[PDB]
Amino acid sequence: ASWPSGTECIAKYNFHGTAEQDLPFCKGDVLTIVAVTKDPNWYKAKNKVGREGIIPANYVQKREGVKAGTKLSLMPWFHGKITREQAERLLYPPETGLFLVRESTNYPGDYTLCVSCEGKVEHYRIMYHASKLSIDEEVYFENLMQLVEHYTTDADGLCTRLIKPKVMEGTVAAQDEFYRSGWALNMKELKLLQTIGKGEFGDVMLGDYRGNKVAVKCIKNDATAQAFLAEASVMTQLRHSNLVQLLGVIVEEKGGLYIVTEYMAKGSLVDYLRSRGRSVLGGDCLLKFSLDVCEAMEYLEGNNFVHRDLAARNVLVSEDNVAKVSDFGLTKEASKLPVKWTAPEALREKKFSTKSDVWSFGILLWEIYSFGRVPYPRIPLKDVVPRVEKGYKMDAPDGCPPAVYDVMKNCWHLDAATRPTFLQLREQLEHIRTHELHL
Numbered sequence: 001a002s003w004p005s006g007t008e009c010i011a012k013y014n015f016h017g018t019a020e021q022d023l024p025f026c027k028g029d030v031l032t033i034v035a036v037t038k039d040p041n042w043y044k045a046k047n048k049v050g051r052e053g054i055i056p057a058n059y060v061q062k063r064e065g066v067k068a069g070t071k072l073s074l075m076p077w078f079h080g081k082i083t084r085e086q087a088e089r090l091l092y093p094p095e096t097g098l099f100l101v102r103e104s105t106n107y108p109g110d111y112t113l114c115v116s117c118e119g120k121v122e123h124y125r126i127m128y129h130a131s132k133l134s135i136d137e138e139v140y141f142e143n144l145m146q147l148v149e150h151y152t153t154d155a156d157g158l159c160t161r162l163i164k165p166k167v168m169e170g171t172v173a174a175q176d177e178f179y180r181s182g183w184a185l186n187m188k189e190l191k192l193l194q195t196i197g198k199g200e201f202g203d204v205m206l207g208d209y210r211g212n213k214v215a216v217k218c219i220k221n222d223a224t225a226q227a228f229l230a231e232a233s234v235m236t237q238l239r240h241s242n243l244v245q246l247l248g249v250i251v252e253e254k255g256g257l258y259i260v261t262e263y264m265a266k267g268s269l270v271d272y273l274r275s276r277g278r279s280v281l282g283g284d285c286l287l288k289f290s291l292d293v294c295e296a297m298e299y300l301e302g303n304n305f306v307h308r309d310l311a312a313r314n315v316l317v318s319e320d321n322v323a324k325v326s327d328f329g330l331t332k333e334a335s336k337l338p339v340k341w342t343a344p345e346a347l348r349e350k351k352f353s354t355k356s357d358v359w360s361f362g363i364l365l366w367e368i369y370s371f372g373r374v375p376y377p378r379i380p381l382k383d384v385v386p387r388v389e390k391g392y393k394m395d396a397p398d399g400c401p402p403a404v405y406d407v408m409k410n411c412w413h414l415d416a417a418t419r420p421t422f423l424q425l426r427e428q429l430e431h432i433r434t435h436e437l438h439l
Helices: 084-090 144-153 174-180 226-236 269-276 283-302 344-348 354-369 384-389 402-411 422-434
Strands: 008-011 030-036 042-046 052-056 060-062 098-103 111-116 121-129 132-134 190-198 202-209 212-219 246-251 257-262 315-317 323-325
Touching (some): 084 098, 111 144, 132 144, 174 226, 174 246, 212 226, 226 246, 226 257, 269 354, 344 384, 354 402, 354 422
Antiparallel strands (some): 008 030, 030 042, 042 052, 111 121, 190 202, 212 257, 246 257
């Protein structure tokens, strides 16, 4: 079947054109299909700037979503909860360098490396502490992939170096999955310029990819890389003008895992507010930011996703002032959470829902109209939930429009079901804007 009009394809190679009708393009460029020609090998398509022309199907890769199934993985040789004996069975015919990683039955929370040395299969314990992996407690690693790169390059103490992986069955190489779905990027074209932020769950760096500024993120404490997979996957499925856009994924076999994202020149919404402040940001600007976030959220709810981590810090601003939700690490379909932003039922119940997201939206608005100030200002972090559950609610910020504050309050009802829908939030923020109840 030919690619329907509107299909997106990423260029695998540079195309210089064979005829005058042809549309040239560079490797990595995004092409939107217009229509297939009389010859299935060529399509009419447009580039980002809109220019149309003919291009070869062979040269482009259809871009599509990737589902982080329970079988999707970056470690063929990883076998999850496999038992010692099982590894012995999986590794029965004595082969030097035949290895496989499994979780640790023996020592809970850690992992175990299993190798076939000399008619025997050695089992080395991999300790997980302070978010790092280590066998000899001399060399540490961020993930099991780097550990395998290492011990494959040299035995470095082990009875033998690793040579051949015992590929678990059902494993789906995420590297070619993201590759075939048009989301794979090349490390050689990425130059990491500087670190924009070193956070608790990941790092973000400004970079240069094929000439354009880009944001690169890596995820901490993710030994199996599943946090990485989960975040990348969901991102390949999100497409809204108020959601930070995924540009691609970078997987170095050594173990460096990165998520390349559009660059947002103005930094987090928190900072933008604090820097420019009250004397610069008018009411329209503040309401405009609220609507931006609200639409992003209505989109997520409409696609059955729960953000679970909505806050001014996780909202970035582009060069021309468009606020976009970012940081989709905790994003999952209707099911640690930041206490000051999370709804009571959410911290207590094991399931999260859009209604908790709405609660967080309420908190975020307060952040917006407070110009970055931190939630629950004069209260100890150990009183919040109990005070809140005892009906406490922050005071409307200084100079906050009463109508805006009522939206906040409406987000803070203790009975989740009574909280507004994101569409109802948009409608009310629009009702406010329409009558200028914010000016």
